[PDB]
Amino acid sequence: PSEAGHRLYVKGRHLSYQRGRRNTHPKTSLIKIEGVDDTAAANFYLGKRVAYVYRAQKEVRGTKIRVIWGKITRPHGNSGVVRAKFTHPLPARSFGASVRIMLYPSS
Amino acid sequence: GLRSLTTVWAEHLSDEVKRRFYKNWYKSKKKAFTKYAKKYAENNGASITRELERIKKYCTVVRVLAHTQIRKTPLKQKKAHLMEIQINGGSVADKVEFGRSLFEKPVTIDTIFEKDEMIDVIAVTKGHGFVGVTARWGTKKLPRKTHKGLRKVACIGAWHPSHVQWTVARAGQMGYHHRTSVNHKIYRIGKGDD
Amino acid sequence: AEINVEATSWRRVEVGRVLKLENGSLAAIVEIIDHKRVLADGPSSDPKLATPRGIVPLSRALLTPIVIPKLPRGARTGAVKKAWEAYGVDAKWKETNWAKKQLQQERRQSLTDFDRFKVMRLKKQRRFEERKALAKIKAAA
Amino acid sequence: GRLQEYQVIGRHLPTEANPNPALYRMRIFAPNEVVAKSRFWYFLRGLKKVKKATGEIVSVNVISEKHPLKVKNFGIWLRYDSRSGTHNMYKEYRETSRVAAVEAMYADMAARHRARFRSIHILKVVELEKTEDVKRPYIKQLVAKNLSFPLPHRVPKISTKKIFSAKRPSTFS
Amino acid sequence: MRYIHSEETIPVPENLKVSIKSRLVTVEGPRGKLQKDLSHIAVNFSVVKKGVIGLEIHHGSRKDVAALRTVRTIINNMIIGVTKGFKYKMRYVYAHFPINVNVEKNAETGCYEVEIRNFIGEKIVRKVVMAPGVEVEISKAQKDELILSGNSLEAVSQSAADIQQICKVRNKDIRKFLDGIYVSEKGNIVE
Amino acid sequence: SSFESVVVIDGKGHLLGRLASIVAKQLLSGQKIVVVRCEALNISGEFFRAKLKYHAYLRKMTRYNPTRGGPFHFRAPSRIFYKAVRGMIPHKTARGAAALERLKVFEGVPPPYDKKKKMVVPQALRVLRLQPGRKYCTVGRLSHEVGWKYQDVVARLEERRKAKGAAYYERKKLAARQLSEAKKAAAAKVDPKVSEALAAYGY
RNA sequence: GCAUCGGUUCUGGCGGGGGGAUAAAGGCCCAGGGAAUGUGGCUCCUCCGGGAGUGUUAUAGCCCUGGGUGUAAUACCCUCG
RNA sequence: GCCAGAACGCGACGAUACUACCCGCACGUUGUAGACGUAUAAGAAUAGGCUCCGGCCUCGUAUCCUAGCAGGCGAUUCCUCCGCCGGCCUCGAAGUGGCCGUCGGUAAUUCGCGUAUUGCAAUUUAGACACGCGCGGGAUCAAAUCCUUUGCAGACGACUUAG
């Protein structure tokens, strides 16, 4: 009974920082959301919240998993990539990791 | 490339071959193929006949393992030598059947070779310790009035090549190399009992 | 002298051939400008199929099997409409496989969340009788 | 670029010796009326002794195609500058309006003869009324009786973001 | 300048059968069968009438249209060869040293082989093997003739050129030493 | 765009340089790629042009010692494709080094990677890019005239696995034939009203 | 974390007004004049698809000039929300 | 053909004392370039193909699966789907899959009790690979180096031999 799954978020990837050709700015990042292609479709996800979860070694308050919170700021380019800003810049080793895109501030 | 997938041994092995698998044979227990021998006379050797059937099915070339009887020579050494010999024949089934029938049997050289046949010889040449350029490569000797030695090479390179190159003669080890000499002829095969 | 040739055969770009534009519109060719552009229009009562008069590039069009017979070259809008209704182009296109496939799509993009649950339960009810018949046939072999 | 035809009328500044001077009118192809006036002074400086400092513009208007939904043949007379010397040609085009032929001619000369916009003068454009006045052989074939042809080997259109298709495409559209 | 439509036609007599599939032509008639592959040329084949074959090219360039006439005559050669065959003749030309040949029979396979001896008094025996389907004969009509026959023009002609190219004089004035074997006539077996 | 665990690409009919650009972008994003049948790739232009290009490559070698530092010229068709990809990746950094472990290349179809679905990249297919009438060559042929030794072995093995798949097709064809008759027989008999309710929903 | 405001800024949708040949075209209607890549007829040839000639709306239709429906609609430019 | 053989390239076989080996599950200090339905096997042509032989093809915008305390306890109903084991066949490119059987689970239809209080959001601590340990069952009783010696070897190590 109840063989279905449990998912209430959209998966994304952390691509790189915001950069020119030789200078990078760790303040903002670029994230590719799954299934979005044009910049018109990317308008739906403005203002939503995203999270980045990873495993640590030590246990602090009953868990070994930390979270970093952020939100989507504006579209980027013509290919549906978006910009995001987090409370702390991403660890810069997660170029290729996965992040979760919520749907909290709806409509 | 090529790779081997199976191999089978005979039931009984002489003490000559067993010496090859050890570096201190005198104080060992000589248990080389003790557990393997029990594969014979167990389910009528069911395990052995399975591997032979596999070679008839998946293989394309078959080789044979043979060794010498060094005990019949005036040599002081008692450790035999082992090698592989390829069988060139009609069919894969014929190769395995012929090879299996020769277990623990002797073969004489007159069955392999015959008179006035052109063969090749492979071995390792005589060794010399450590030699200079004059004897190793064969360069001209320097004049009699040379300071700091006269059995050398005067110039070993130009300037902006900037490194000693791999094509310049230099001192080192001579001899004890592997060589293959071809096209030798056989005059006579003599029998020992005669 | 029996001759059998198995070669492809396309559809010709002639006068009277009706195209299907990218945004679900129909137009009848009345004049050929180049090998890349044509002049076409379609007078249709249905606002979904109607198109104005103008030039359409041939790389954004598809050739439908319908062709209007004996359409005079360079005819005006009034004469084209007369032949458009007489041949019954609107009824002919409705029964083609291309039209049915598009219609079968449209019902799917407009489905309420409550309606998605409803179609899942109905599919399972029909699926139950399929496995009963499949097992019976497989056992019979 | 994207052009359209104008008419522009000029005049020498009136003086006490010569009141009521003559009036000159030209047809100029230009993207906008700001550069339409500039071309008028350029052509006029080569025919009469009038400048912009001693002249004035009387009127500028826009000429529009009378029947922009009819197919017709055009012929153009022109001169240009090569890398050594000047030459004259006469080419033909097939389309629906007068303005686009000048657009088509500008792109054609830039490719086949490497001639820029700076060095082309247009002498006269006339629409060929009949069918027996077509000269060049690449246009008689487009006016043949009962023209029809297929379109073999046309690539289907696939979204540029959908990588990794799941089956082999076909080219029999 | 790209040409909209270029077309050619090939008639077919009421004696043989022809079938085309995936640009692979098979021609079969009274004297045998031949095949040719034309997958490297973009042509559209069609059946114009009861006994006429049509082929055409759409939107082709000047260079592309050129190949249209090449294809037409090649297929016509196939039809002729299967109903009439081909026949070549050769002659010997020598000043002092006679030329001796020996056309030995099939060498355990379909190929024929021709041996040429005593060319300008040399001790080489030089051997050439013909392509399959080609039969070499020594003529009896008159002296110093070689007759080659077969079904396909490509095989008959290439084998004939092989014999001519092997008899060459080196380090001599070729305007004076006209020794060699040359081809002299081309035609069909029938008529 | 979609995120899969791993994707298998069939290499036959793909242009060498156009396919390598797509692959190098996916690897740096985080995707895993497997390229199969690297001996059936294609290069535009006549074969003689490619041979002259390769011969100029072979002439480069370190002068003072050919065993170190010199450009090592790999001769296998999978290694030629690998060289193209390595030039489009910053392989001298840790980030670039990690990307190369997500790529696998083979000649033929090894036993792990048959019985799998093979995708196709339509932006590098030859039949959709080149103009008809032009000339092209095959990477597999080019490797033969530079020292590749196992061309005929792969040809024999490929004929075996293609014969095995012919028998599998017969079983698959039978299963589809039986399923069609079951749906026709069941749907008529039983369901009174589920049919048209489903039809109005687009199913 | 949410609701109500202030400063800066990016990006969607809707309602109006003006201009030009008071857009040009276009639909319907009235009057006049033409032609061919000649519709229907007629003649000849080909039955093998059809082709050739004559000739101005008929059993298809096209082009040019003037008027009404008109202060028609629409495109482009500017402007008030 | 011939010479070297990656000291971070690979395969076959022999004997393995010291828990070093094999089987079962018990937890978890500890590790990871990054599970959250990680679901899909014909070949071939592209100026031609597929098929259930009636037909079909621009389109993966497809197909399968998908309800219940993170998914309870019973009943009316129904012979469907899934899993651990066992036995026969099969698989060698870097060896995989099939059939049969026992056992355990199971909304296709329709019902009866239980959910609160985590207080208006805070990762939904849930997957599979290794590795360290703790038990209780099975099998097993080996070698290498130093040292003396040899000269087919040798600057010293190393190498060919003997004890």
Residue B186 is classified by DSSP as: -
**Tokens linked to B78:** 């008692």
Q: Residue B172: CA atoms inside 13 Å, Cβ hemisphere, count?
A: 7
Rounded Cα–Cα distance for residues F94 and F162 (Å): 41
Question: What burial class does residue B87 get, using C-beta atoms within 10 Å of its C-beta: 0-12 exposed, 13-18 middle, 19+ buried?
Answer: middle
Long-range own/partner contacts, residues E127-135 (CB < 8 A, 24 or more apart): E128/E162, E128/E163, E128/E166, E130/E159, E130/E162, E131/E155, E131/E158, E131/E159, E134/E159
Q: Can you read off the two tokens belonging to residue F109? A: 């179809």
Match 């069918």 to its residue by tokens.
Answer: D131
Report the alpha-carbon distance of residue F174 to residue F163 in Å, rounded: 18
**Considering only alpha carbons, which residue of chain A is nearest residue F94?**
A93
User: Quick check: do E and A touch, 3+ CB pairs under 8 A?
Assistant: no
Neighbours of chain C (3+ CB pairs under 8 A): D, E, F
Residue C89 to residue C26: CA distance in whole angstroms: 10
Cβ atoms of D110 and D116 within 8 Å: the answer is yes
Residues 37-96/E with CB < 7 A to strand H: 39, 42-45, 56-60
Q: Cα dist. B15→B67, B68, B70, B102 in Å?
A: 12, 12, 11, 19
Residue C92 identity (one-letter amino acid): K
CA of F24 to C1' of H12 (A): 39
Question: How far is it, in rounded angstroms, from Cα A82 to Cα A36?
Answer: 10
On whether any CB of chain E is under 8 Å from the CB of F133, the answer is: yes
> Which residues have CB under 8 Å from B104's CB, separation 6+?
B10, B11, B12
Determine which of C9, C13, C64 to mutate to test the interface with D (most D C-beta atoms within 10 Å). C13
CA distance E164 to A74: 81
Residue D7 CA, distance from chain mean position: 15
> Which CA distances in Å does B187 have to B182, E68, E74?
16, 72, 66
Interchain CB contact of E62 with D (< 8 Å): no
Between CA F97 and CA F58 the distance in angstroms is 26
Cβ-contact F154, F107 below 8 angstroms: yes
Per the structure block, which two tokens stand in for A53?
Answer: 């979860």
Q: E44-63 burial, b for 16+ CB within 10 Å, e for fewer?
A: bbeeeeeeebebebbbbeee
The two beta strands, F33-36 and F7-10, are: parallel
Q: Decide: E29 and C1 in contact? Cβ < 8 Å.
A: no
Residue E130's CB is within 10 A of a number of other CB atoms, namely 23
Tell me the Cα Rg of chain F: 23
Instruction: Give the separation between CA F101 and CA F99, rounded to whole angstroms.
Output: 6
Compute CA distances A49 → A45, A88, C97, whole Å. Answer: 9, 14, 45
Is the CB of residue A41 less than 8 Å from the CB of residue A81?
no
Query: Do F12 and F37 meet the contact criterion of CB atoms below 8 Å apart?
Result: yes
**Given CA atoms F32, F37, F38, F41 in this order, what sign does their dihedral have?**
negative
HSE-CB for B178 with a 13 A CA cutoff:
0
Mutation for C interface: D65, D67, D70, D71, most C CBs within 10 A: D71
The chains found to touch F (3+ Cβ pairs under 8 angstroms) are: A, B, C, D, E
Interatomic CA–C1' length for residue B179 and nucleotide H2, angstroms: 9
Q: Tokens at residue C127, please?
A: 């699926």
Contact, D131 CB vs strand G, < 7 Å = yes
Please state whether strand H lies within 7 Å of residue B88 at its CB atom: no
Taking the CA of residue D73 and the C1' sugar atom of nucleotide G33, their distance in angstroms comes to: 24
Chain H bases near protein Cβ (<7 Å): 1-4, 10-16, 30-49, 51-52, 56-62, 65-68, 70-72, 79-81, 92-95, 106-109, 121-126, 142-145, 150, 152-155, 160-163
Amino acid F2 CA to nucleotide G11 C1' distance, rounded Å = 28
Q: Is the CB of A74 under 7 A from strand G?
A: yes
In the numeric block, which tokens belong to residue F93? 């950094």
User: Is strand G in 7 Å reach of the CB of C74?
Assistant: yes
Do the bridges between strand D72-81 and strand D86-95 make them parallel or antiparallel, or are there none, so unpaired? antiparallel
Question: Cβ–Cβ of E44/C1 closer than 8 Å?
Answer: no
Q: Please enumerate in sequence order all residues whose Cβ is within 8 A of that of D158, keeping only pairs 6 or more positions apart, or say none.
A: D165, D169, F122
Sign of CA dihedral D141, D143, D146, D152: positive
Strands A81-86 and A65-76: antiparallel
**Which residue do the tokens 């589809």 mark?**
F176
Tokens representing residue F92 in the block: 């001298």
Residue type, F91: H
Can you say how many angstroms the Cα of residue C56 is from the centroid of all Cα atoms in its chain? 18
Long-range contacts of E123-129 (CB under 8 A, 24+ apart): E126/E166, E128/E162, E128/E163, E128/E166
The CB density around residue F37, as the number of other CB atoms within 10 Å, is 23
Element (H, E) at E29: strand E24-29
CB interface of A with D, residues 41-60, below 8 Å: none
Asked if F64 and B160 touch (Cβ cutoff 8 Å), the reply is no
Nearest Cα residue to E14 out of E50, E45, E41, E43: E50
Alpha-carbon torsion angle E91, E93, E96, E99, nearest 10: -30
- Encoding tokens for residue F30? 């985080």
Helix (H, G, I), strand (E, B) or coil at E191: coil
- Is the CB of C70 less than 7 A from some atom of nucleic acid strand G? yes
Q: Is there a contact between E153 and E139 (Cβ–Cβ < 8 Å)?
A: no
Q: Which of F103, F31, F25 is nearest to A98 (CA)?
A: F31
Kindly list the residues of chain F whose beta carbon comes within 8 Å of any beta carbon in chain B.
63-66, 150
CA angle E25, E31, E37 (to 5 degrees): 15
**Main-chain dihedrals φ then ψ at residue C64, nearest 5 degrees:** -90, 155
SS3 state at C82: helix
With an 8 Å Cβ cutoff, is D154 touching chain F?
Answer: no
Please report, rounded to whole angstroms, the spatial distance between the CA atom of protein residue C120 and the C1' atom of nucleotide H82: 21
- As beta bridge partners, residue F195 has none
Cβ within 7 Å of strand H: which of C 36-75? 62
Resolution (A): 3.1
Calculate the alpha carbon distances from B103 to B12, B98, E52, E154 in Å: 9, 10, 76, 61
Q: D148 to chain C: nearest residue by CA?
A: C14
Residues of chain F positioned with their CB less than 8 A from the CB of C138: 178
Candidate from A36, A37, A95 with C-beta closest to F95: A95
F104 within 8 A of F37, measured Cβ to Cβ: no
Q: Of F9, F15, F2, F30, give the one whose Cα is nearest residue F116.
A: F9
Which residues of chain B form beta strands (DSSP E)? 63-67, 82-86, 118-124, 127-131, 172-175, 178-185
User: Is the distance between the Cβ of D34 and the closest atom of strand G smaller than 7 Å?
Assistant: no
CB D152 within 8 A of CB E58: yes
Instruction: Indicate the SS3 state at residue B113.
Output: coil
Contact E68, E77 (CB under 8 A): no
Helix (H) or strand (E) holding A19: strand A10-19
Tokens of E89: 């003749």
d(C-alpha B6, C-alpha B61), whole Å: 12
Check residue F185 and give left, alpha or beta (phi > 0: left; psi -120 to 50: alpha). Answer: alpha
- Please say whether the beta carbons of A62 and A56 come within 8 A: no
Residues F19, F13: Cα–Cα separation, whole Å: 10
D152/E5 touch (CB, cutoff 8 Å), yes or no: no
Interior angle at CA F195, CA F189 and CA F196, nearest 5:
135
- List CB contacts of B45: < 8 A, sequence separation 6 or more: B39
- Distance of residue A12 Cα from the nearest chain F Cα, in angstroms: 9
Among F24, F40, F67, F20, smallest CA distance to F143 is for: F40
**Per the CB < 8 Å rule, is F63 touching B165?**
yes
**CB-neighbour burial class of residue C71 (10 A; exposed 0-12, middle 13-18, buried 19+):** buried
Give the residue with minimal CA–C1' separation from H72. A1
